[PDB]
Design a binder for this molecule. Structure first.
Ligand SMILES: [Cl-]
Ligand code: NA
Ligand code: NA
Ligand code: NA
Ligand code: NA
Lengths: 216, 459
DNA sequence: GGGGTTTTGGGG
DNA sequence: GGGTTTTGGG
DNA sequence: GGGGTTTTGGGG
C-alpha cells in the first residue's frame, strides 16, 4: 500500500540493491512536482515529502535552451515536470548531506525537466525530508542490516567462542572489554562499507555553479 | 513589582502587568522568520482555570501567553505541565474571546520558571537537587530577582497547582484527540497517551511507541536533544501532531519543529489514572513475527524488575570506554540494548555443552552425557545505535555454568542432540534474534573483560 | 521613559 | 497568537 | 550608540 511517489520509488530502489532496472516499470513515468526551495538547496515535493533532484550538465543546458526566460534558481513555489530521470545509490557523509541517512543516499538524477510556469498546485500537508521519515529510515536500516549480516557471516567463522574458563573461576582474572570487539568485515577503514550494490556514478552539477551561470 | 491575578488583570490599562501562573500547555520555542522566535502557552491560576461548569463538562478555562524573542535561548522550554511561570512587563488584550497576555522578551519583558515538584524535569534527569524552593530553574536575561513578599505567592500557587491537578484533569477531553480517530482530522491535533516504549532508532533519534485511552498504538520520532525527558511508563501530552498517510506498515504521528511533548506533575490525576488504565500492548510485535520483514521494532526480552530502575549503557561505552571512564570502571553490572547480528556456535545443537566444574572445561554432548552438567555456552555478536556505522560487532556471552542467564530462553539447558523439543524452541528463538528489527534489552555482568547476560528472559 | 552601557548628551 | 527555521532542539 | 518604542528630545 502507498501514496507518496517519492517514498515508493526510493523504497523500492533500496529494497532492490540499488538496481534501478529492477524497480517497477509502471513508476518510471513523468514526475510532476512542486518546488519547495531552489537555493541554497533545490528541493521538490510529491505532496508529502521533499527530495533533492540532481541535474546533469546536459539537463541544465537543455532547460536554458528551451526556456531562456526562465532561471532554475528562481523556480521556488513553481512547478516542474521531470520527463527523463533515473535513480541511483551513493555513499555520502550523512553528517553533511541532510538528504541522506546512514551515509547512504538515493539520488534522483534529472536529465530533462520542463517548468510549467504559473501552475497552481493542490493544497497539501507540509512537506518533510523523506530521509527523516520513520518507515523510510527503517527501510534503510533493513538494507544495512542485510549487508552487515552477510558480511559478518562470511568474515566470522570457526566458532571462536570465549573459553569457559576465562569467565568461570575468574576471581584473580582481569581483562579488557575490547577483547570482545570483533571486525564485521574486511573493510579498509573504521567504517563498515562491505556492500554489494554498485554505487551509481553520474557527473552532476552543484547548485552553486548554476547560480553563477545565471548571475555570477 | 505588583502581581495581579489572571482574571483581575486590566484589559484597558494596556500598561505592563506582571503575574504568577501555572502552565498547562505550551508549544516548543520555534523560529518564524530570519529574526524572531515564538513560544505560545496556556496558563491558569486560582481565578482562571475552569469554564462555567454546568454545561461546560469540566472543561478547563485558561488565558494564553505569547512570548516573543530574537533568540531561541530567550524563550522557555516547557517539558512538564503543572510547573509555574513568572512574567514581568506583559500587556494583556482580548484575542478571539480570550485573555491573551503578550510579552516581548527582546525588549523589556522577562520570565522565570519555578518547579512545582521537588525537582524540575532537568534536575530529575540529572539526579540533582534544586538550590531552594524560591530558586527559578530557568529564566530569561542574565538575572532573576525574587523579593521576600513573593515567597508566600509562590508557595501558595504551588499548593494550588497540586490541588488543581489532583482534583481535575487539567488537560480536558476537548484538548486532545483520540488516536483511533487521528486519521479523521483535517490538520494537526493533540494527543494524550502513555509511552509503552522508547526505541533508540539512531544516534540522535528516539522512536516512541504510544498508546492512549482509545487503545490505539502509534509511533512517532522524538529527537534526543529536544525531548530528553521521555520515559517508558510515563504519560505525556503531545502538542500538535499530524497523521502520516504515507505509512502503511505502522501508524505514525508526525511532529513539527513547534510541536512539544509534555509530562505531568506528580499530583496529576489524569496522568495517574492513565498510567494505570492503559496497559502494555504487544499485538504489534506478535503480528510482526509472522512477516518476513517487519518495519516495526520488536523487543524480544525483558529484564528483571529489580533492574527496571537501572539506566542503560551503549555498546560504545561498554566496549570502548569501560576501561578508561572513571564511572564505567566502578560498575560491574550494566544494562544495555542491541540487536543480534550473528550467534555462535552456528549449530544450535551445540548451544548446550557438558560442563566439568572441576577442570573448568566444557565439551560437546554429541558423545552423550559423559561431559558433565548441561549448560548454555552461547556467544552473541551484537551491534547497536551508538556503533551502527563502525566496522565492529561485539561479543555478548550467555554462559550459564554459574546460573547467570540460565532462563534466558525459557528453555532449561538439555542435550539438544536428543531433545527435539528443546532444540526446536531454540532454533526458533535463533531466527527471531537475528531477524531485522529484533532487539535485546538486557543486564550484563562484567567478568574478566567479557560481558555475561543475566536477569533476562523472552517475547 | 528606561536598559545596559558609556554614549555620560543625543539618532532614527 | 493553533505555528513552518536551517542550526536542514530551533 | 542603538532597540524598542513613542519618549519623537532627553535621565541617571
Ligand atoms: Cl574485568
Ligand atoms: Na546612556
Ligand atoms: Na539612552
Ligand atoms: Na532612547
Ligand atoms: Na526614543
Amino acid at each position: 500500500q502507498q501514496q507518496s511517489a517519492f517514498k515508493q520509488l526510493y523504497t523500492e530502489l533500496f529494497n532492490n540493491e540499488g538496481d534501478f532496472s529492477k524497480v517497477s516499470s509502471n513508476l518510471k513515468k513523468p514526475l510532476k512536482c512542486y518546488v519547495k526551495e531552489s537555493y541554497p538547496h533545490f528541493l521538490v515535493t510529491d505532496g508529502y515529502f521533499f527530495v533533492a533532484p540532481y541535474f546533469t550538465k546536459e539537463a541544465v543546458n537543455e532547460f536554458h535552451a528551451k526556456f531562456p526566460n526562465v532561471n532554475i534558481v528562481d523556480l521556488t513555489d513553481k512547478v516542474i515536470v521531470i520527463n527523463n530521470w533515473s535513480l541511483e545509490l551513493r555513499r555520502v557523509n550523512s553528517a553533511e548531506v541532510f538528504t541522506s541517512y546512514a551515509n547512504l543516499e538515493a539520488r534522483l538524477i534529472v536529465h530533462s525537466f520542463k517548468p510549467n510556469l504559473q501552475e497552481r498546485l493542490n493544497p497539501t500537508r507540509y512537506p518533510v525530508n523523506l530521509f527523516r521519515d520513520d518507515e523510510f529510515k527503517t527501510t534503510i536500516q533493513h538494507f544495512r542490516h542485510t549487508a552487515l549480516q552477510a558480511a559478518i557471516n562470511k568474515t566470522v567463522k570457526g566458532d571462536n567462542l570465549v573459553d569457559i574458563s576465562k569467565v568461570a573461576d575468574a576471581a584473580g582474572k582481569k581483562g579488557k572489554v575490547d577483547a570482545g570487539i570483533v571486525k564485521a568485515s574486511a573493510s579498509k577503514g573504521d567504517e563498515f562499507s562491505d556492500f554489494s550494490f554498485k554505487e551509481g556514478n553520474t557527473a552532476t552539477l552543484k547548485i552553486a555553479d548554476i547560480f553563477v551561470q545565471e548571475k555570477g | 513589582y505588583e502581581y495581579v491575578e489572571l482574571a483581575k488583570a486590566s484589559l484597558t490599562s494596556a500598561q505592563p502587568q506582571h503575574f504568577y501562573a501555572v502552565v498547562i500547555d505550551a508549544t516548543f520555542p520555534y523560529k518564524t522568520n530570519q529574526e524572531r522566535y515564538i513560544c505560545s502557552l496556556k496558563i491558569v491560576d486560582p481565578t482562571l482555570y475552569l469554564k462555567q461548569q454546568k454545561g461546560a463538562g469540566d472543561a478547563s478555562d485558561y488565558a494564553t501567553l505569547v512570548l516573543y524573542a530574537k533568540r531561541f535561548e530567550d524563550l522557555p522550554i516547557i517539558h512538564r505541565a503543572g510547573d509555574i511561570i513568572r512574567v514581568h512587563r506583559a500587556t494583556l488584550r482580548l484575542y478571539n474571546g480570550q485573555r491573551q497576555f503578550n510579552a516581548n522578551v527582546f525588549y523589556s519583558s522577562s520570565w522565570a520558571l519555578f518547579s512545582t515538584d521537588k525537582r524540575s524535569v532537568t534536575q530529575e534527569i540529572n539526579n540533582q537537587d534544586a538550590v531552594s524552593d524560591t530558586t527559578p530553574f530557568s529564566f530569561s536575561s542574565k538575572h532573576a530577582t525574587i523579593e521576600k513578599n513573593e515567597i508566600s505567592i509562590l508557595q501558595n500557587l504551588r499548593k494550588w497547582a497540586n490541588q488543581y491537578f489532583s482534583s481535575y484533569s487539567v488537560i480536558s477531553s476537548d484538548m486532545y484527540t483520540a488516536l483511533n480517530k487521528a486519521q479523521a482530522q483535517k490538520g494537526d491535533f493533540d494527543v494524550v497517551a502513555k509511552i509503552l516504549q522508547v526505541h533508540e532508532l539512531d544516534e540522535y533519534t528516539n522512536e516512541l511507541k504510544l498508546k492512549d485511552a482509545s487503545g490505539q498504538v502509534f509511533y512517532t520520532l522524538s529527537l534526543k536533544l529536544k525531548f530528553p525527558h521521555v520515559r517508558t511508563g510515563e504519560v505525556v501530552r503531545i502538542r500538535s501532531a499530524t497523521y502520516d498517510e504515507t505509512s502503511t506498515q505502522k501508524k505514525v504521528l508526525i511532529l513539527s519543529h513547534y510541536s512539544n511533548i509534555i509530562t505531568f506533575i506528580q499530583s496529576s490525576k489524569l496522568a495517574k489514572e492513565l498510567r494505570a488504565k492503559i496497559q502494555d500492548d504487544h499485538s504489534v510485535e506478535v503480528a510482526s513475527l509472522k512477516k518476513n520483514v517487519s518495519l516495526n521494532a520488536v523487543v524480544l526480552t525483558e529484564v528483571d524488575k529489580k533492574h527496571a530502575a537501572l539506566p542503560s549503557t551503549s555498546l560504545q561505552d561498554l566496549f570502548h570506554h569501560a576501561d578508561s571512564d572513571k564511572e564505567l570502571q566502578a560498575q560491574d553490572t550494566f544494562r544495555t540494548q542491541f540487536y543480534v547480528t550473528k550467534i555462535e556456535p552456528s549449530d544450535v545443537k551445540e548451544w548446550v555443552k557438558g560442563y566439568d566444574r572441576k577442570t573448568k572445561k566444557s565439551s560437546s554432548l554429541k558423545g552423550a552425557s559423559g561431559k558433565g552438567d548441561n549448560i548454555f555456552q552461547v556467544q552473541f555478536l551484537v551491534k547497536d545505535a551508538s556503533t551502527q556505522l563502525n566496522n565492529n560487532t561485539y561479543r555478548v556471552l550467555l554462559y550459564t555454568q554459574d546460573g547467570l542467564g540460565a532462563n534466558f530462553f525459557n528453555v532449561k539447558a538439555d542435550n539438544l542432540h536428543k531433545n527435539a523439543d528443546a532444540r526446536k524452541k531454540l532454533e526458533d528463538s535463533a531466527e527471531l534474534l537475528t531477524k531485522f528489527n529484533s532487539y535485546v534489552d538486557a543486564v550484563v555482568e562484567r567478568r574478566n573483560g567479557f560481558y555475561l547476560i543475566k536477569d533476562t528472559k523472552l517475547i
